[PDB]
Protein backbone atom coordinates (compact mmCIF):
# COMPACT_ATOMS: atom_id res chain seq x y z
CA UNK A 1 0.00 0.00 0.00
CA UNK A 2 1.04 3.63 0.45
CA UNK A 3 0.10 5.60 -2.66
CA UNK A 4 -0.64 2.36 -4.50
CA UNK A 5 -2.24 4.57 -7.15
CA UNK A 6 1.33 5.33 -8.23
CA UNK A 7 1.23 1.83 -9.71
CA UNK A 8 -0.75 1.81 -12.99
CA UNK A 9 -1.83 -1.83 -13.19
CA UNK A 10 -2.61 -1.37 -16.87
CA UNK A 11 -1.30 -4.89 -17.48
CA UNK A 12 -4.86 -6.20 -17.50
CA UNK A 13 -4.63 -9.87 -16.53
CA UNK A 14 -7.67 -10.50 -18.71
CA UNK A 15 -8.82 -8.88 -21.95
CA UNK A 16 -12.16 -7.76 -23.36
CA UNK A 17 -12.58 -11.21 -24.90
CA UNK A 18 -15.08 -9.70 -27.33
CA UNK A 19 -14.59 -7.55 -30.46
CA UNK A 20 -15.86 -4.00 -30.01
CA UNK A 21 -16.87 -1.67 -32.88
CA UNK A 22 -14.52 1.16 -33.84
CA UNK A 23 -17.66 3.15 -34.64
CA UNK A 24 -17.47 4.55 -31.11
CA UNK A 25 -13.81 3.85 -30.35
CA UNK A 26 -11.15 6.55 -30.28
CA UNK A 27 -7.62 5.21 -29.86
CA UNK A 28 -5.52 2.79 -27.81
CA UNK A 29 -2.55 3.02 -25.46
CA UNK A 30 0.02 0.27 -24.71
CA UNK A 31 0.76 -0.96 -21.19
CA UNK A 32 4.12 -1.55 -19.53
CA UNK A 33 6.40 -4.45 -20.45
CA UNK A 34 7.14 -5.39 -16.85
CA UNK A 35 3.92 -7.39 -16.60
CA UNK A 36 3.09 -11.10 -16.58
CA UNK A 37 1.00 -10.49 -19.69
CA UNK A 38 0.64 -6.83 -20.78
CA UNK A 39 -1.45 -5.91 -23.82
CA UNK A 40 -3.18 -2.67 -24.80
CA UNK A 41 -6.19 -0.74 -23.52
CA UNK A 42 -8.66 1.00 -25.81
CA UNK A 43 -10.10 4.37 -24.80
CA UNK A 44 -13.49 4.70 -26.49
CA UNK A 45 -14.53 8.14 -27.69
CA UNK A 46 -16.99 8.62 -24.84
CA UNK A 47 -17.39 5.05 -23.58
CA UNK A 48 -14.65 3.60 -21.40
CA UNK A 49 -11.31 1.78 -21.44
CA UNK A 50 -10.99 -1.77 -22.77
CA UNK A 51 -8.02 -4.05 -22.19
CA UNK A 52 -7.09 -6.06 -25.28
CA UNK A 53 -4.19 -8.02 -26.76
CA UNK A 54 -2.91 -7.02 -30.19
CA UNK A 55 -2.52 -10.77 -30.61
CA UNK A 56 -6.29 -10.97 -30.99
CA UNK A 57 -7.95 -10.32 -34.34
CA UNK A 58 -10.34 -7.42 -33.78
CA UNK A 59 -7.71 -5.83 -31.55
CA UNK A 60 -5.27 -5.95 -34.44
CA UNK A 61 -7.62 -4.29 -36.92
CA UNK A 62 -8.28 -1.48 -34.45
CA UNK A 63 -4.55 -0.89 -34.11
CA UNK A 64 -4.50 -0.19 -37.84
CA UNK A 65 -7.87 1.56 -37.73
CA UNK A 66 -6.72 3.84 -34.93
CA UNK A 67 -3.37 5.57 -34.27
CA UNK A 68 -2.39 5.64 -30.58
CA UNK A 69 -2.72 7.77 -27.45
CA UNK A 70 0.37 9.98 -27.57
CA UNK A 71 0.47 12.93 -25.17
From Swiss-Prot:
Disulfide bonding pattern of the chain: 11-35, 12-51
GO cellular component terms given for this protein: extracellular space; protein-containing complex
Similarity field: Belongs to the intercrine beta (chemokine CC) family.
Gene: ORF K4
Part of the whole protein covered: 24 to 94 of 94
Any one GO biological process: immune response
Described function: Blocks infection by several different human immunodeficiency virus type 1 (HIV-1) strains. This occurs because vMIP-II binds to a wide range of chemokine receptors. May form part of the response to host defenses contributing to virus-induced neoplasia and may have relevance to KSHV and HIV-I interactions.
Protein name, per record: Viral macrophage inflammatory protein 2
Subunit structure: Monomer. Interacts with human chemokine receptor CXCR4.
GO molecular function annotation: chemokine activity; CXCR chemokine receptor binding
Species lineage: Viruses, Duplodnaviria, Heunggongvirae, Peploviricota, Herviviricetes
Domain of life: Viruses
Record keywords, A-Z: Cytokine, Disulfide bond, Secreted, Signal
Subcellular location: Secreted
